[PDB]
Amino acid sequence: ATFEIVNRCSYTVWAAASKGDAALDAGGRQLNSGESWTINVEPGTNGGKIWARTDCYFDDSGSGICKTGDCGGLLRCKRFGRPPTTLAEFSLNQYGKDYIDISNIKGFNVPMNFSPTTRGCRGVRCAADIVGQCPAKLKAPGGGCNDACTVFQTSEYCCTTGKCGPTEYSRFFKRLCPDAFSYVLDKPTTVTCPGSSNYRVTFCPTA
Numbered sequence: 001a002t003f004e005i006v007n008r009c010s011y012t013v014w015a016a017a018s019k020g021d022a023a024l025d026a027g028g029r030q031l032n033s034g035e036s037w038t039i040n041v042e043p044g045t046n047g048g049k050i051w052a053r054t055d056c057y058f059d060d061s062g063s064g065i066c067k068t069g070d071c072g073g074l075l076r077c078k079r080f081g082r083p084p085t086t087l088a089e090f091s092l093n094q095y096g097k098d099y100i101d102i103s104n105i106k107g108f109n110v111p112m113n114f115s116p117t118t119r120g121c122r123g124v125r126c127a128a129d130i131v132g133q134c135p136a137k138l139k140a141p142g143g144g145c146n147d148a149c150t151v152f153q154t155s156e157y158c159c160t161t162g163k164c165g166p167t168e169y170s171r172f173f174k175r176l177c178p179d180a181f182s183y184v185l186d187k188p189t190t191v192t193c194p195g196s197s198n199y200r201v202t203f204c205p206t207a
């Protein structure tokens with residue numbers, strides 16, 4: 001499957017793509033403002049994620065640091081990124097269909113649109129100014145808006161036992177972005193697409 005990753009932000013981002021125990025394609029790349037990077041994701045990829053990283057430094061070997069979304073200091077991510085990270089999430093070729101969503105469960109750093117480039121389903125978007133409107137206690141000093149699990153480490157926020165409700169913090173994310181997951185047990189906003197669809201992830205789609 002192809003994923004065209006487009007940075008419409010006025011700032012550079014370092015895109016990342018992983019399924020948690022492996023890179024997808026090269027795993028990461030710098031995208032200056034306006035740049036597009038197209039990756040190939042293997043069919044059947046389950047639990048893949050794409051995110052932006054901000055304020056990164058990498059040496060000539062691809063090792064360094066980012067202020068949001070850092071994946072063990074690598075340019076080319078093999079692992080998931082450090083919150084806060086707005087997440088484009090997908091599982092492909094699952095009994096004939098693809099499933100996509102955006103999640104704020106690991107916080108929000110950069111606005112995003114995640115849409116198919118082929119027919120048969122809608123896209124999803126979380127493009128509101130979550131960082132600017134972020135509740136004081138969730139603001140990340142390194143940049144972004146943390147989720148409450150990251151900040152407080154409670155069973156209720158982290159849904160540790162599979163029982164939790166919405167919270168004042170989850171409701172903030174949900175109000176700003178109704179079409180993204182705001183907590184683990186949120187009413188799903190997953191979109192079913194034809195199996196083997198292709199996609200575009202656009203950072204700062206309206207920004």
Ligand SMILES: O=C(O)c1cc(N2C=C(CCO)NN2)cc(C(=O)O)n1
Nearest residue numbers: 019020021022047072078079080081
């Ligand atoms: O993002 C990480 O840091 C990470 C992700 C992991 N994984 C592994 C998967 C795939 C299936 O479990 N997903 N995330 C595992 C570990 C770790 O053991 O330290 N760490």
Ligand SMILES: O=C(O)c1cc(N2C=C(CCO)NN2)cc(C(=O)O)n1
Nearest residue numbers: 071072073079080081082083084150
């Ligand atoms: O570098 C890692 O693999 C890593 C760093 C982690 N963290 C988490 C923090 C605190 C705030 O994010 N600092 N390092 C957590 C994990 C994991 O759970 O597998 N992995």
Ligand SMILES: O=C(O)c1cc(N2C=C(CCO)NN2)cc(C(=O)O)n1
Nearest residue numbers: 020021022071072073078079080081
């Ligand atoms: O604590 C972690 O989350 C962790 C520790 C790791 N390791 C591995 C070693 C041994 C030698 O590198 N030390 N910490 C690796 C990972 C990861 O890949 O996600 N995560």
Ligand SMILES: [Eu+3]
Nearest residue numbers: 071072079080
């Ligand atoms: Eu780890």
